[PDB]
Amino acid sequence: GSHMTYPKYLLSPETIEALRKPTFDVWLWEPNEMLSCLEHMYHDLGLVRDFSINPVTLRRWLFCVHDNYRNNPFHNFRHCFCVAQMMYSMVWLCSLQEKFSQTDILILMTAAICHDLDHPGYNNTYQINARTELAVRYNDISPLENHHCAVAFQILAEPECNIFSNIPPDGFKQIRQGMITLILATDMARHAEIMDSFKEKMENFDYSNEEHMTLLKMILIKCCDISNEVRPMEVAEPWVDCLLEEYFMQSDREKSEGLPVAPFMDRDKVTKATAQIGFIKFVLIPMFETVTKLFPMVEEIMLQPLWESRDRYEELKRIDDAMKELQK
Ligand SMILES: C[C@H](c1nc2c(cnn2C2CCCC2)c(=O)[nH]1)N1CC(Oc2ccccc2)C1
Ligand SMILES: [Mg+2]
Numbered sequence: 052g053s054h055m056t057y058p059k060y061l062l063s064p065e066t067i068e069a070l071r072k073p074t075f076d077v078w079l080w081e082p083n084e085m086l087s088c089l090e091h092m093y094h095d096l097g098l099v100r101d102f103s104i105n106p107v108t109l110r111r112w113l114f115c116v117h118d119n120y121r122n123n124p125f126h127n128f129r130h131c132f133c134v135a136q137m138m139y140s141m142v143w144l145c146s147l148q149e150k151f152s153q154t155d156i157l158i159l160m161t162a163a164i165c166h167d168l169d170h171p172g173y174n175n176t177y178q179i180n181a182r183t184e185l186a187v188r189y190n191d192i193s194p195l196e197n198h199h200c201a202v203a204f205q206i207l208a209e210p211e212c213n214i215f216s217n218i219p220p221d222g223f224k225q226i227r228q229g230m231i232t233l234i235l236a237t238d239m240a241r242h243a244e245i246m247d248s249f250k251e252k253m254e255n256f257d258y259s260n261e262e263h264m265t266l267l268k269m270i271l272i273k274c275c276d277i278s279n280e281v282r283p284m285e286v287a288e289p290w291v292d293c294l295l296e297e298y299f300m301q302s303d304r305e306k307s308e309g310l311p312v313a314p315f316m317d318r319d320k321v322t323k324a325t326a327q328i329g330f331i332k333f334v335l336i337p338m339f340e341t342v343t344k345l346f347p348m349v350e351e352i353m354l355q356p357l358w359e360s361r362d363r364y365e366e367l368k369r370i371d372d373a374m375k376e377l378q379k
């Protein structure tokens with residue numbers, strides 16, 4: 052709705068507004084547009100101002116991060132954009148600037164962007180079972196998450212990419228420790244442990260307690276990481292096919308190499324519907340339910356689409372079941 056046409060990398064006022072909501076269609080944008088979106092988030096959240104981030108360094112850093120994301124069906128730059136856009140949406144929805152310091156917002160945003168850097172498209176179970184260079188390097192302790200972390204700090208060590216160059220050493224150490232904790236917390240093998248620890252703190256939550264806040268930040272990055280089903284159906288649905296494509300690539304390789312195959316990755320056992328019913332019911336809904344205890348606004352905005360999505364996949368399952376009996 053402007054007097055002239057502006058290039059794609061110059062975000063329209065409408066795009067800037069839409070970016071604050073979890074309804075934002077992540078599929079409409081090319082890498083350069085998503086890069087402009089992330090850059091806007093840093094300026095808009097006051098991170099550029101409060102951490103004296105050089106605006107050109109912010110751009111070079113984001114471009115370098117983008118280049119270090121592999122062209123995987125799911126674990127790609129668009130996924131990191133989803134996680135960072137969901138984190139940004141949660142800052143506004145949950146009024147996180149009232150509860151968190153600017154350093155904490157910086158940690159949450161930087162970890163969301165960096166969390167899946169240089170992902171090979173084969174999970175930790177593959178790395179460990181196949182005894183890969185990564186599993187050997189990390190001694191089977193979250194090999195991928197440790198690698199995403201190392202790559203993040205390797206990018207940040209390059210002077211033209213150092214968005215933390217004007218932050219005192221004590222501030223850097225604080226941000227570094229926080230980012231490591233958050234990226235490592237994304238390992239789904241640790242889900243039950245992190246959920247139990249958070250629920251334990253949820254008995255009498257304290258925003259002044261550093262340990263309570265560390266666990267809340269861990270839950271926040273975890274929420275954003277697996278948040279696809281929270282998005283509108285049309286935006287959410289294509290991500291499942293992307294992930295199954297990655298899961299099938301791994302399970303085929305494991306079968307060929309004689310390694311164990313996870314049933315949720317097996318082409319002969321998995322369907323888009325059955326995989327999502329379980330994940331929404333037993334992972335997504337319980338996690339957002341605990342967040343709702345601190346942030347009641349999460350129920351209407353995030354649990355509601357999850358309830359709808361669960362109900363839609365249950366309808367699709369009945370169709371798949373009717374279809375699969377004719378297959379034999
Ligand atoms: C396909 C399903 C699944 N997995 C997802 C989603 C988002 N992130 N992830 C994973 C990417 C790497 C970490 C998490 C998602 O929407 N569905 N998968 C999960 C499995 O289903 C279950 C079911 C119950 C409990 C745990 C996993 C089939
Ligand atoms: Mg990951």
Ligand SMILES: [Zn+2]
Pocket residue numbers: 130134166167237276
């Ligand atoms: Zn991820």
